[PDB]
Amino acid sequence: MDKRVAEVAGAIVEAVRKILLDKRVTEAEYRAGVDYLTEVAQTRETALLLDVFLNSTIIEGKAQRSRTSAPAIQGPYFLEGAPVVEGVLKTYDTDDHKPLIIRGTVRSDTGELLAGAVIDVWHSTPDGLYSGIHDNIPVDYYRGKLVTDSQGNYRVRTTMPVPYQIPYEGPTGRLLGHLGSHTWRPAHVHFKVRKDGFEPLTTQYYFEGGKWVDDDCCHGVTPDLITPETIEDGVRVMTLDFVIER
Amino acid sequence: MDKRVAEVAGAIVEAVRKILLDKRVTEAEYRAGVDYLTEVAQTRETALLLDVFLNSTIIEGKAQRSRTSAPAIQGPYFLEGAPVVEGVLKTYDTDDHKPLIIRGTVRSDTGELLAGAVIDVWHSTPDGLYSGIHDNIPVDYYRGKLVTDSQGNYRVRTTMPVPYQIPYEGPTGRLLGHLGSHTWRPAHVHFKVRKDGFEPLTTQYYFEGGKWVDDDCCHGVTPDLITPETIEDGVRVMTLDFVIER
Numbered sequence A, B: 001m002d003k004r005v006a007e008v009a010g011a012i013v014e015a016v017r018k019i020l021l022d023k024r025v026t027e028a029e030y031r032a033g034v035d036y037l038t039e040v041a042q043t044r045e046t047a048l049l050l051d052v053f054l055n056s057t058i059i060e061g062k063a064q065r066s067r068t069s070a071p072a073i074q075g076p077y078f079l080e081g082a083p084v085v086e087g088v089l090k091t092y093d094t095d096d097h098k099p100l101i102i103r104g105t106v107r108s109d110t111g112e113l114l115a116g117a118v119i120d121v122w123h124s125t126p127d128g129l130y131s132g133i134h135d136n137i138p139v140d141y142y143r144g145k146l147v148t149d150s151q152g153n154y155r156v157r158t159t160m161p162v163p164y165q166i167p168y169e170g171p172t173g174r175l176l177g178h179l180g181s182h183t184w185r186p187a188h189v190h191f192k193v194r195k196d197g198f199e200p201l202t203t204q205y206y207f208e209g210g211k212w213v214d215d216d217c218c219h220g221v222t223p224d225l226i227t228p229e230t231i232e233d234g235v236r237v238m239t240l241d242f243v244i245e246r
Ligand SMILES: CCCCCCCCCCCCCCCCCC(=O)OC[C@H](COP(=O)(O)O)OC(=O)CCCCCCCCCCCCCCCCC
Pocket: A016, A025, A029, A030, A032, A033, A034, A035, A036, A037, A046, A049, A050, A053, A054, A174, A175, B002, B004, B005, B008, B009, B012, B013, B016, B037, B046, B050
C-alpha cells in the first residue's frame, strides 16, 4: 500500500469510471478503446501518447510551485553523457545549416550569478532528427554541455533547429486527428541546467514567428519561452538567463 | 474529427489533467508514472491493467441500459471457433477433475424460448489454465458450443473450474499491491449466448461459497452471477436460464 500511488492512481481510476458511465460507453466501444491502447503499447507509443495530453499540464503545475526561469516539457530526446564544450557544438558542415548563437547567464533564484553550472543542451538537426537517436547520427553531434564561468556566463555557437512532427503514422497521430489537432511542434532548443547545489531546471525555447508556435500539438509553448527575433552579423541569437532555485 | 472519440477521449484527458494539478503531481512523479505504464506496455499487460479497474464498471453500464440475464465481464480467454457439442466438453481424464453439470434454457426478453441458439462456453482447467492459451493445451479442450433444442434447452457435462490469479509478476500485480487489492479471481464459467437474430449476451457465473467471491481483484462478481450450491448424485450443478434481448 503506497499512500501516494494510491492517492493519485486511485483518483484517476475513480475519475475515468465516471466518464465510462456518464458518456455511456458500450461494451463494444470499450473494446475499441482497449484495442486502441494496445496498439499504442504495440507501437511503443505509450509514453508519447501520454506526453502529448499530459506533460504540458505537469509543467503548468511545477511553474506554479517554484521560482525559476520558465520551465518547459523535457521531451524523449535527451541523452545524458553529452560532451562538455567551450565552445561550439559539433554539427555537420553541410549547406542547409543556419548559424545560431546562444549567450546568457545562469543564476540563483536569490540573484547570485552561479559559476561552474552545467548547462546541458540538445536540439534537432536541420531535418528534425536528434543525434544518436536517429538515422546513424553520432551522439557528440547536436549535443553538448556548457559550463558557466566565473561570471556565470555561457556562450555557444551552433546550427539552427527546425520544427518536427511527433510520429504521425501510428495510433497517437490519428487519435490527435480525431481530436482535431495535428502532429507538429515548433522549432525549439533544449536546455537542462543543473548546478551541484541546486534543483535541475529543464526547459526548451522557441523562436518568435516560427511555424507552429501558435499551434503546438503538445501544448508546451508559453510566452516566456518565445525568444524575440534578433540577428547579429546575420546570425540568429538567443540570449537566455536561467534561474535555478534552491 | 470523430465526434464520439473526441467526446469520450477528450472527457478523460480533461479529467486526468485536473488530478495532475490538484494532487500536485511533480515532474519526477509524472516520469515515474509514465515509466510505469511503458512497463505495463512492455509486459503486454496494457489491456489487462485496463480490464481490472474499468471493464467491471462497463458491465454495470450495460446492465443498466438493457434487459438480459445478468451480464459479466468477458475476459481475455475467449477464443472463437469452439467445437459444437451435444454434449460433453472435452477434458482430461485425470484424477483432480471434479464433474460439473450445466443445464437450462435460453430465451427472449419477450419470453419466447429460443431454439438453435448457440451457447458458447469456456472455463479453466483444474490448474487455472485456459485451453489453447496455456502450456500446450489443445483448443477443443475445456471449450464448446451448445445449441438449444426445440424447447430452448441446453445441457452439458464438464469438469469443474478453479480460481486463478491474473498475472502477478508484473507492473499490474504490484500496482494492485499499492492499491491494497490482490491478484485473485473466484472460480467461474464463461458463457456467450448468440442467436442469429439477437444481441450477444456475454457473462460468467461463480459458485456460492467459493474462495474470492467476496474479494474479486477485478470487481465483476455480482449477486445474480452467484449460483447456489446444488449437487446431484455428487455432481455440482448449474441451472442457468439466459435471456438475450432484441
Ligand atoms: C495504458 C494507458 C496509456 C495512456 C493513456 C493516455 C493518457 C491520456 C490520454 C489517453 C487518451 C484516452 C484513451 C482513449 C483512446 C480511445 C481510442 C478510440 O476511441 O479509438 C477510436 C475508435 C476506432 O478508431 P481508432 O482510433 O483507429 O481505434 O472509434 C471507434 O470506432 C469506437 C468509438 C470510440 C469511442 C470510445 C471512447 C473511449 C473508450 C475507451 C475506454 C478505455 C479508456 C481507458 C483509458 C484510461 C486513460 C488513463
